[PDB]
Design a protein that fits this description.
Distance between the termini of chain C: 45 Å
Number of strands of chain C: 4
Chains: A mainly alpha, B alpha+beta, C alpha+beta
Shape of chain C: flat
Structural class of chain C: alpha+beta
Organism (chain A): Saccharomyces cerevisiae (strain ATCC 204508 / S288c)
Strand content of chain C: 15-25%
Order of helices and strands of chain C: HEEEEHHHH
Bound molecules: magnesium ion
Family (chain A): Belongs to the bacterial ribosomal protein bL34 family.
Oligomer: part of a larger assembly
Largest sheet of chain C: 2 strands, antiparallel
Number of helices of chain C: 5
Radius of gyration of chain C: 19 Å
Protein name (chain C): Large ribosomal subunit protein bL28m
Helix content of chain B: 25-40%
Order of helices and strands of chain B: HEEHE
Distance between the termini of chain B: 31 Å
Structural class of chain B: alpha+beta
Protein name (chain A): Large ribosomal subunit protein bL34m
Radius of gyration of chain B: 11 Å
Subcellular location (chain A): Mitochondrion
Chain lengths: 45, 55, 146
RNA sequence: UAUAUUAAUAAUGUUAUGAAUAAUUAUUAAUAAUAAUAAACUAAGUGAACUGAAACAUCUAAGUAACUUAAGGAUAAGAAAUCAACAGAGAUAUUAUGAGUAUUGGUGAGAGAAAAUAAUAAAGGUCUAAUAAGUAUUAUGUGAAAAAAAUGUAAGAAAAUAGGAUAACAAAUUCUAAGACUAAAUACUAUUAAUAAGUAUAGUAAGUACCGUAAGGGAA
RNA sequence: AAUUAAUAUUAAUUGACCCGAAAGCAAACGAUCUAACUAUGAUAAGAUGGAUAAACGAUCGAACAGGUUGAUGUUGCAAUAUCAUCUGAUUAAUUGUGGUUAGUAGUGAAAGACAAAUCUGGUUUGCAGAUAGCUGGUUUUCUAUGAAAUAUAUGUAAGUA
RNA sequence: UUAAAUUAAAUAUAAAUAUAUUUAAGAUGGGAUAAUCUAUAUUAAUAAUUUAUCUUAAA
RNA sequence: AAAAACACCGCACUUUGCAGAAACGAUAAGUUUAAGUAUAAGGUGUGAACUCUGCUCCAUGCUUAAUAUAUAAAUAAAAU
RNA sequence: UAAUCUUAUACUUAAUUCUUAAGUAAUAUAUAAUAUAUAUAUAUAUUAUAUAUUAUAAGAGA
């Protein structure tokens, strides 16, 4: 039985999608800049 | 090329005897550039001459 | 020839100082290269390429079927004597450059040739080498006391 | 661990022998401190494909999108090794005409100059090179659908009594490569002022609610 | 007799009357689902048979893990469930926590199986108004005239001259 | 395992970057003592894969 | 769709002498192979064991040997 | 084979550390002279002059 694909764990989620993860890599930086340009309020977890 | 190999020389005064190459010290010879660069010139064993003031 | 991928490089013009938010810890040992370091074929920055770069063109068949290809310069790693430094200096060397060196009589001569073209077709490493050589020469000429 | 450490001193308590050693407080001196920084515009590197050709592979889209790098208030270009035609002009930039002409293309799809004359423009000329080779040139492989200038690989010149420019040669013209600087017209942003046969579903909310793990999408 | 402008028609190029693919390529995002590997932990009642007290991809059998057959369910309790039945159950076992590998592309005891409800190759942004000889749609009124479905050619026969 | 981090010239590469090597980070693991309760600081010197605990022997 | 399909233990063929072979690497350095070294490692078929595995290199490959034999780029100098 | 490639591992002076220059000592190599031993050749010792302080070893090798 599918449907329950997101299996929350705070550690994994901060480590993968978190602000610090984004800011550490060049690709991540691009993403953050993109979100800033769009004016998103929340740049990442 | 072959022609280039045959004919292209560089003029140098050797500052040391080189038995193998038959270039005795002090003498001014026209040698192949490879020879100059890879053997002679190392350790001030020779010196290029572009003109008579280089001598 | 043209030195289009050298003389087109531009570097942030320094503001002269009669402080900045971030100053470097070390001291600039070498003089700034006019044209800076190449961000194009960075393989070239390690040695003496004579302003030759990778070309990109088309492989073409008997059916005129285009397909991208690159062209590399004939680089050779080569330890060559420097009278002024009193040691052999090994570097990457386009064979053309080697030939030029041979013609001109020594690596020092090659480095220390005045023309702007020569300056252009040195790398940053080349520039550094030149600086070393000329400084050394100066030292030799002119001890502290006359 | 700058309510830092080191040094110097000053008051203080302890120990061993007025001098020596450690602890705390207080003054003076010395010694480092903190990349939040745009976006578009410009230049450069790499560089698709869908598509068009009523199929498709040459060609096309297109040196466009995209990614990457670097600079500046702008950037690039720029004072002829240029154009022209035996008469001449006189830096670039890009608008009218020239001209959809010359040129060119599986001579298909299609692509397409320059001279010249006008505008726009600013004072537009002016030395910062002891005047330029592995350079010009050649061979070969690439290279702005038309006009080269570039470039990988090897061969490789000449002194103004000389070079470059045209399939080729002969005349004749013209310019001087391998050294350089350059405002103005221009691009994009932001502000102000004006004009709207513009917008109230292009009239300020919100990049919020919400949707997705995420990039991302996205209301009323 | 031209030429210039306005107005109208037709024609070429640009998305060119409007809507609509499957696709291709570029750059990104995802391995909290899932696969394999990897590091570290944890679980496997009890009984039996073996040439060992302790050696077996051994036997019976709970937990755990499967998913054989049937019934129900099919806008369900549920975008795969329930009940019964059936299989493995010390291992090529199951499982927690973290990590690695994926978009010409990984993992795969291989089923084109899985890579976040499903892939003979994801998703998002862009090229982008791709292209569509195909389908559908194209909004007031009144007047005048009013066809064709034949021939020829066509990679042409749903088209076009 | 990860890290625009670290060796005229670490090595390689159109750019992006990739690589080995150091340094740092990284739990799911390891980490003194202690109810007859216990002191981690500063200075000076020179472990374990699994599994069984039988038989014998003694009293 | 749980099977007669994959895997398997075993059997066979083969490549590679380690500065290897295989794989990955706009391709490179370099990694896995392996702190391994032919009784190993990669690939391929078949698929425990028992009785067994006949005949055939025409063709497509591989593989060894030569001589037979053509051609591509790359050169002097010299002839119309 | 000093083509290419592979692998392993002291003082003095001048501008606390760094760099230059001079000489002297230390070690190595090359050349020259003298003394001794052996069969014109080889070995050892002494003296003079020159050069060096990326290396060494191993391997492939035009
Ligand atoms: Mg969901
Ligand atoms: Mg990751
Ligand atoms: Mg570009
Ligand atoms: Mg400028
Ligand atoms: Mg300029
Ligand atoms: Mg065009
Ligand atoms: Mg000039
Ligand atoms: Mg949600
Ligand atoms: Mg990713
Ligand atoms: Mg049991
Ligand atoms: Mg069992
Ligand atoms: Mg059974
Ligand atoms: Mg049972
Ligand atoms: Mg299953
Ligand atoms: Mg796991
Ligand atoms: Mg099938
Ligand atoms: Mg499977
Ligand atoms: Mg009628
Ligand atoms: Mg049709
Ligand atoms: Mg740590
Ligand atoms: Mg089933
Ligand atoms: Mg068998
Ligand atoms: Mg085998
Ligand atoms: Mg089979």
């Amino acid at each position: 039985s599918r449907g329950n694909t997101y299996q929350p764990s705070t550690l994994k989620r901060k480590r993968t999608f978190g602000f610090l993860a984004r800011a550490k890599s060049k690709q991540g930086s691009k993403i953050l800049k993109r979100r800033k340009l769009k004016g998103r309020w929340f740049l990442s977890h | 090329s072959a022609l280039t190999k045959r004919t292209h020389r560089v003029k140098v005064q050797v500052l040391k005897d080189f038995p193998r190459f038959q270039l005795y010290k002090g003498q001014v010879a026209n040698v192949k550039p490879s020879l100059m660069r890879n053997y002679l010139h190392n350790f001030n064993g020779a010196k290029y001459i572009l003109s008579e003031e280089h001598d | 020839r043209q030195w289009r991928l050298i003389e087109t490089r531009k570097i942030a013009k320094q503001p002269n100082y009669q402080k900045p938010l971030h100053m470097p810890k070390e001291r600039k040992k070498f003089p700034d290269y006019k044209y800076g370091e190449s961000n194009i074929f960075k393989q070239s920055n390690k040695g003496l390429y004579g302003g030759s770069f990778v070309q990109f063109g088309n492989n073409i068949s008997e059916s005129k079927a285009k397909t991208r290809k690159k062209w590399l310069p004939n680089v050779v790693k080569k330890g060559l004597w420097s009278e002024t430094l009193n040691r052999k200096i090994s570097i990457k060397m386009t064979a053309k450059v080697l030939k030029t060196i041979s013609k001109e009589g020594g690596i020092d001569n090659y480095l220390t040739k005045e023309k702007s073209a020569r300056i252009k077709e040195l790398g940053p490493t080349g520039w550094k080498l030149r600086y070393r050589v000329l400084k050394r020469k100066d030292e030799i000429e002119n001890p502290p006391h006359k």
